[PDB]
């Protein structure tokens, strides 16, 4: 199978930008590779074909290049509607084979996460479970790594992370990490910290609440 | 105008098996080939075959062999592509693409989601969350236990919400929301999240409690 390495997985840029993706195949595919747009919420759109050819309805500012194995997608002055995804697509040999896409994401200032524990409540500790909830809110970049302290010691065990989209009015990131125990468990212990590392700050950002 | 029209979202039990259709309008059909295009974990994208309706002749990529079956059905200008043996690893997103047969370029249908699962559908669970100052104060809901997705949680019905993408805890799922409002405002009013589940005709009120 021919693979196609996609460089770069994810770029953070800025309007009127000039913008460079590349697509790297395992062998010559003789110009025969496409690129596609999917932007966010929506289905795919053709791009360029057969390396150099635009698909209908594709502004100018779209160019494709390269020969042989190496190729790539030129946007000149990036515009609004240009923040999506991208791929390649290999058709020299079966199976057509894609690149693992390009995000381009809406570069911003730094922004400080806003950061909120939450015991579990009443009515789940009646069910067995005990979940603690970390919010972090309207930070960027989106890199943030997080940590659990209980009584001042990690647990990685029963962590679930999520991470929202960029964001569609101030083009920030929120995450929210849950910390899941058996009642048994959580009540054994009785301080609980959510501890954020970030950009932004050279220290830690941490709460934390009293059992 | 180019139209691939496709079958709606799609949920089955493991074993079981699911036919996704491709209605194919404004060009003659036989002309160009059909491929079907798997997305799963976002980033994924896997050609799965295809059929030149013409001679009903198709390829398929050695991973999708027996898992995948494409027809046309020339008459009503429709590609299908049947899903068989289905497993957990086949949820997805499921595109028929059109393309054309001597330059490659490309039309794509709006997608099908697949979600396979053993789960039987079951209402969530909503615990509120609130904390254990400051002019602002965040609270949430986290929506635990349900299937299959997807809810919708409304804040007092009615900016300021984040709502997380829902995560796949044993066969289940989990979902918080957050909201921040004035400190002023609760706990001297009442904070409500309100979460409906159509699978399940579910709506259930939590009030936000200090
Ligand atoms: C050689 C002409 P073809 O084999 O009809 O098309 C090539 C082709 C097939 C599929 C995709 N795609 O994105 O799924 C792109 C391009």
């Known amino acids: 199978d021919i693979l196609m390495t996609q460089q770069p997985s994810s770029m953070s840029v800025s309007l009127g930008d000039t913008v460079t993706i590349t697509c790297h195949a395992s062998?010559?595919?003789?110009?025969?590779i496409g690129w596609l747009q999917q932007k966010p919420g929506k289905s795919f759109k053709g791009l360029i074909y057969?390396?150099?050819n635009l698909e209908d309805e594709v502004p100018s500012r779209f160019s494709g290049s390269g020969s042989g194995a190496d190729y790539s997608l030129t946007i000149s002055s990036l515009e609004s509607e240009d923040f999506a995804d991208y791929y390649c697509?290999?058709?020299?040999?079966?199976?057509?084979?894609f690149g693992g896409g390009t995000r381009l994401e809406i570069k911003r200032a730094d922004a400080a996460p806003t950061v909120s524990i939450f015991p579990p409540s009443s009515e789940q500790l009646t069910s067995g479970g005990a979940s603690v909830v970390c919010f972090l809110n309207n930070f960027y970049p989106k890199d943030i790594n997080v940590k659990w302290k209980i009584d001042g010691s990690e647990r990685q065990n029963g962590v679930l992370n999520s991470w929202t989209d960029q964001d569609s009015k101030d083009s920030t990131y929120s995450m929210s990490s849950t910390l899941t125990l058996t009642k048994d468990e959580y009540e054994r212990h009785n301080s609980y910290t959510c501890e954020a590392t970030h950009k932004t700050s050279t220290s830690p950002i941490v709460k934390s609440f009293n059992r | 105008e180019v139209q691939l029209q496709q079958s709606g979202p799609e949920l089955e039990k493991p074993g079981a098996s699911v036919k996704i259709s491709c209605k194919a309008s404004?060009?003659?059909?036989?002309?160009?080939?059909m491929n079907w295009v798997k997305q799963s974990n976002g980033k994924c994208l896997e050609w799965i075959g295809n059929?030149?309706?013409?001679?009903?002749?198709?390829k398929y990529n050695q991973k999708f062999e027996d898992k995948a079956t494409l027809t046309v059905d020339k008459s009503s200008s429709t590609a299908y592509m049947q899903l068989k043996s289905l497993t957990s690893e086949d949820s997805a997103i499921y595109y028929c693409?059109?393309?054309?047969?001597?330059?490659?370029?490309?039309?794509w249908g709006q997608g099908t989601t697949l979600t396979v699962s053993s789960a039987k559908t079951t209402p969530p669970s909503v615990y509120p969350l609130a904390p254990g100052t400051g002019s602002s104060v965040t609270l949430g809901c986290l929506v635990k236990g349900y299937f299959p997705e997807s809810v919708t949680v409304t804040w007092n019905s009615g900016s300021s919400v984040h709502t997380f993408p829902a995560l796949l805890q044993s066969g289940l799922y989990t979902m918080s929301s957050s909201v921040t409002v004035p400190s002023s405002t609760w706990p001297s009013q009442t904070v409500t999240c309100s979460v409906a589940h159509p699978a399940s005709s579910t709506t259930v009120d939590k009030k936000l409690e200090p």
């Open positions: 693409v059109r393309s054309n047969k001597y330059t490659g370029s490309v039309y």
């Open positions: 404004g060009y003659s059909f036989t002309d160009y080939n």
């Open positions: 059929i030149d309706p013409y001679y009903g002749s198709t």
């Open positions: 062998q010559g595919i003789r110009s025969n």
């Open positions: 057969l390396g150099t």
């Open positions: 697509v290999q058709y020299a040999q079966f199976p057509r084979t």
